[PDB]
């Protein structure tokens, strides 16, 4: 099999009767990764993300049998406080890279000023301390430091943008690569779209809405706004989630608030939702134990 991480690529000889937990543990041991609960192995079926089941046969999955057979090692779940919950430099680094990619690809909205500060920590992490003798005008010119949306919002040239980033970069002197990547994560985790799984749903009337699923609970959004939910259901505020046919129903732990019901058509998606729900709830509770 071919295992693709954010920064690296592995090749593995897999035994035909091995299970997800075997291949996962193999990748985890190879990386030196002891906090395994955040991660998973991803392939996508028909435009939909899917994850490798631990207790099921590897080749039983819908993954393309055509060689090489390819899975992406990625964080499935996100901590509530990155600095507090990510102990190993390896786990931190994995999150840093994946999150930074989400932000650059505009999977996670970041506003312009924050995006410049984020870019500056990424530069600190890669190049170490700012050195005007080492780093002169044009030194970032081939890097992609900013979302295109931020760049397009202004008339600024690459050197104008380099100047804004370098101005911030200069002030980070003294922070080690891991500390810089963690400062990046502290900012990114406060972004509103950070760590949220979005799914198109519809309510009883048939109004198209968005279901978010994250570490803190469940959220309903107007399709146009992914930043602020119209409704939130914190994990410790919900009695049960129910699924049958194409429908979900959310029953609040307080009987005096209406249950929320919605329709989700695609079946593969619905499993993902339940998976994500169970996973996120589990992690929510264990932080509070």
């Amino acid at each position: 099999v071919r295992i693709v991480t954010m920064d690296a690529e592995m090749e593995f000889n897999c035994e035909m009767k091995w299970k997800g937990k075997d291949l996962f543990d193999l990748v985890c041991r190879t990386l030196g990764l002891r906090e395994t609960w955040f991660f998973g192995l991803q392939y996508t079926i028909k435009d939909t993300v899917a994850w490798l089941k631990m207790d099921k046969k590897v080749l039983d999955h819908d993954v393309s049998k055509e060689e090489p057979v390819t899975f992406h090692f990625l964080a499935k779940f996100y901590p509530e406080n990155a600095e507090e919950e990510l102990v190993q430099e390896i786990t931190q680094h994995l999150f840093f890279l994946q999150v930074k990619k989400q932000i650059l690809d505009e999977k996670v909205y970041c506003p312009p000023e924050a995006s410049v500060l984020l870019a500056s920590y990424a530069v600190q992490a890669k190049y170490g301390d700012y050195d005007p003798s080492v780093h002169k005008r044009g030194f970032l010119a081939q890097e992609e430091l900013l979302p295109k949306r931020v760049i397009n919002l202004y008339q600024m040239t690459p050197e104008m943008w380099e100047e804004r980033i370098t101005a911030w970069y200069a002030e980070h002197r003294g922070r080690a690569r891991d500390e810089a990547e963690m400062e990046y994560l502290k900012i990114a985790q406060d972004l509103e779209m950070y760590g949220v799984n979005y799914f198109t749903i519809r309510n009883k009337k048939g109004t198209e809405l968005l279901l978010g699923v994250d570490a803190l609970g469940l959220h309903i959004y107007d399709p146009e706004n992914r930043l602020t939910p119209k409704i939130s259901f914190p994990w410790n505020e919900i009695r049960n989630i129910s699924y049958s046919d194409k429908e979900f129903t959310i029953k609040p732990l307080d009987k005096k608030i209406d249950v929320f019901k919605f329709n989700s058509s695609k079946l593969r998606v619905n499993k993902l939702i339940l998976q994500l729900c169970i996973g996120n709830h589990d992690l929510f509770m264990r932080r509070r134990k």
Binding site: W235, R239, S242, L253, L274, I278, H281
Partner: peptide, 11 residues
Amino acid sequence: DEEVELILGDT
């Protein structure tokens, strides 16, 4: 499409 329920918490 199997029926699923998640019971969260104890109450």
